[PDB]
Amino acid sequence: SGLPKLPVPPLQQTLATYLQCMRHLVSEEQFRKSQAIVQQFGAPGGLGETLQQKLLERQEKTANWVSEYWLNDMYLNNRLALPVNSSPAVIFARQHFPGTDDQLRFAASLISGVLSYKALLDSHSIPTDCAKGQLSGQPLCMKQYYGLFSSYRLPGHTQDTLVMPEPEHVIVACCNQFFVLDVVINFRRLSEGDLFTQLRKIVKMASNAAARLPPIGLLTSDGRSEWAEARTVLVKDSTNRDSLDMIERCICLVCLDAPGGVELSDTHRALQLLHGGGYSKNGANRWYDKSLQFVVGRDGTCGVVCEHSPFDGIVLVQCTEHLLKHMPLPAPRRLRWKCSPEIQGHLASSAEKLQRIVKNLDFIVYKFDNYGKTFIKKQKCSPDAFIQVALQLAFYRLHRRLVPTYESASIRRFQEGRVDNIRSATPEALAFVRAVTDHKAAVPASEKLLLLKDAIRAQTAYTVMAITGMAIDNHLLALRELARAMCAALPEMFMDETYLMSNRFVLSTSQVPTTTEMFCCYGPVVPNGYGACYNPQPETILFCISSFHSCAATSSSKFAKAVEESLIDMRDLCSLL
Numbered sequence: 269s270g271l272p273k274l275p276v277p278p279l280q281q282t283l284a285t286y287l288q289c290m291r292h293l294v295s296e297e298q299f300r301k302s303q304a305i306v307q308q309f310g311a312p313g314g315l316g317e318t319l320q321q322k323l324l325e326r327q328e329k330t331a332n333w334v335s336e337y338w339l340n341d342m343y344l345n346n347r348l349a350l351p352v353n354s355s356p357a358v359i360f361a362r363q364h365f366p367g368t369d370d371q372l373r374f375a376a377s378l379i380s381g382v383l384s385y386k387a388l389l390d391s392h393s394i395p396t397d398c399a400k401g402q403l404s405g406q407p408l409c410m411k412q413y414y415g416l417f418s419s420y421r422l423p424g425h426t427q428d429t430l431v432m433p434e435p436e437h438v439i440v441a442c443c444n445q446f447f448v449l450d451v452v453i454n455f456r457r458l459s460e461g462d463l464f465t466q467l468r469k470i471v472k473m474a475s476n477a478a479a480r481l482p483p484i485g486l487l488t489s490d491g492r493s494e495w496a497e498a499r500t501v502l503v504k505d506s507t508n509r510d511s512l513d514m515i516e517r518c519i520c521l522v523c524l525d526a527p528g529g530v531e532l533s534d535t536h537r538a539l540q541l542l543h544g545g546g547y548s549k550n551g552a553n554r555w556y557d558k559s560l561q562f563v564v565g566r567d568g569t570c571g572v573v574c575e576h577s578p579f580d581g582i583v584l585v586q587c588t589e590h591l592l593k594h595m596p597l598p599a600p601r602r603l604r605w606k607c608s609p610e611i612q613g614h615l616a617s618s619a620e621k622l623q624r625i626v627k628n629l630d631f632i633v634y635k636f637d638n639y640g641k642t643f644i645k646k647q648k649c650s651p652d653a654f655i656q657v658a659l660q661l662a663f664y665r666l667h668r669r670l671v672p673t674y675e676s677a678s679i680r681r682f683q684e685g686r687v688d689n690i691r692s693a694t695p696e697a698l699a700f701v702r703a704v705t706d707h708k709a710a711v712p713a714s715e716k717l718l719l720l721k722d723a724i725r726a727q728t729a730y731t732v733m734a735i736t737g738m739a740i741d742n743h744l745l746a747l748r749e750l751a752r753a754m755c756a757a758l759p760e761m762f763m764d765e766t767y768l769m770s771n772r773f774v775l776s777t778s779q780v781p782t783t784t785e786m787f788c789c790y791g792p793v794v795p796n797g798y799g800a801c802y803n804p805q806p807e808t809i810l811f812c813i814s815s816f817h818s819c820a821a822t823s824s825s826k827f828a829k830a831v832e833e834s835l836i837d838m839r840d841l842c843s844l845l
């Protein structure tokens with residue numbers, strides 16, 4: 269690989285940055301105890317320097333010293349059910365399908381797009397991406413592509429595990445029934461015309477009452493430990509091993525959803541993609557372990573549910589946008605399943621667990637249309653920095669406090685680079701939000717403007733630092749797991765209540781820009797948090813906001829309102845004179 273290896277930040281740089289990031293997010297007392305804790309950990313000849321030495325060694329022996337640690341910490345270790353908690357959804361524009369054939373024609377074409385896109389992939393014919401935005405021109409890592417269709421996430425009791433065959437095939441799910449659709453014989457990739465024909469056969473078969481099998485997919489929408497256990501039960505029978513193996517070895521799935529009941533709003537269409545609406549809608553017409561699940565609903569609701577561990581939103585969207593821009597026949601096989609009274613019980617639990625997730629998701633698509641990048645650029649500001657500050661102002665004006673915030677910073681500059689964290693809850697953002705919201709202080713508007721720019725200055729400074737591998741989250745993560753390898757009892761540095769708080773991201777954000785008329789979204793990462801995915805355009809900014817109804821403190825409608833208001837105030841501050 270001609271790409272640089274992810275840098276190893278100097279120990280003292282990270283420890284200083286660490287403390288600086290949290291000072292204003294914890295009490296004075298607690299902060300004093302942490303300074304002391306950090307001081308000892310980072311003292312000369314201390315424990316910190318010892319771990320750093322191990323890290324430099326690991327760096328030299330590996331391609332990317334955090335891939336393993338990060339992949340397990342961020343996704344494989346998480347026990348929450350994938351729907352909403354982990355697996356994001358990309359929603360395509362609304363389609364219009366008068367007759368079933370219009371739905372199946374779409375699905376056929378889409379599948380042909382997948383095939384040829386997998387061809388370019390297999391022949392490394394895909395053009396190597398370059399940076400754009402913040403520090404642009406350099407080559408980017410492409411490894412994430414080659415994870416799009418070649419992955420499956422196996423459940424495990426405490427830790428999940430991430431992952432050619434012949435014939436090559438896709439699994440088509442209709443009416444919660446799973447079918448095997450071979451798409452490539454001997455490098456012969458079926459015609460869009462024959463794929464259509466095969467799909468009509470599946471739809472017909474999935475409508476036979478005497479053959480209808482139990483909704484096994486439902487099992488994959490359950491907590492990872494629960495699915496690991498129920499799968500252990502299935503594995504006892506040979507017929508189930510077989511079908512599971514088939515699902516495990518497919519390219520992706522193609523879900524032919526039944527007509528959704530509600531209105532086809534952007535919000536409702538997204539709900540359908542995130543969780544399918546529960547077991548009574550399309551909630552079982554899935555298999556979350558698989559990487560990509562392309563949805564082609566009868567009514568026109570389409571998109572693709574994605575299993576996060578193998579790749580991130582940027583890569584996914586380029587493939588997706590490429591897919592859409594592109595846009596003797598044996599019968600398809602139906603996967604068999606041999607259920608027992610055990611499985612019947614498990615399907616019941618999953619059904620109830622999945623209903624809570626659907627019942628608990630408070631989601632909304634907000635499109636800000638007063639202005640976009642263009643206006644922001646006219647203020648000598650980074651659109652993303654501006655938007656990140658906007659979100660801080662929204663959280664504070666609504667909740668009266670700032671909280672540890674997360675923002676996906678892509679590090680694909682380096683080998684196997686995924687992402688590091690940009691902590692937007694800066695001290696300069698606290699001073700800005702306090703000046704704007706504290707009426708009593710009567711801070712002059714000209715002063716608010718200064719603080720606004722200073723805030724946008726710190727966000728951009730952290731961003732630059734994060735995308736160049738000099739941030740602090742991955743670094744600390746690596747130091748933590750190395751120490752654990754030394755002794756199961758972690759140092760006080762990582763048992764400190766301060767370190768623990770810094771990682772509960774009550775505000776989890778990311779940017780997924782797209783040229784098309786599609787958008788990305790996902791659930792919060794903590795019970796009392798928000799999920800904010802935005803798409804900044806020249807004149808608009810699309811906000812996808814999520815939170816949990818279980819937390820009386822959060823509200824996606826109120827937060828969206830608060831974002832609008834924050835963007836308006838900032839436009840006003842910038843239009844003074």
Ligand SMILES: CC(=O)CSCCNC(=O)CCNC(=O)[C@H](O)C(C)(C)COP(=O)(O)OP(=O)(O)OC[C@H]1O[C@@H](n2cnc3c(N)ncnc32)[C@H](O)[C@@H]1OP(=O)(O)O
Pocket residue numbers: 356400401402403576580581582641645646647648649650651652653676677678679687731735778779780788789
């Ligand atoms: C499953 C999922 O979906 C979740 S996974 C997460 C997926 N997303 C990511 O990983 C985020 C990837 N993006 C990055 O890492 C970026 O570096 C981040 C940190 C988001 C920053 O994005 P950027 O593209 O740099 O945005 P930003 O600088 O604000 O805006 C870029 C434009 O804003 C301009 N600009 C920046 N500072 C400016 C300034 N001071 N004055 C005038 N213009 C400025 C840039 O020149 C650029 O112009 P153009 O390309 O539109 O012609």
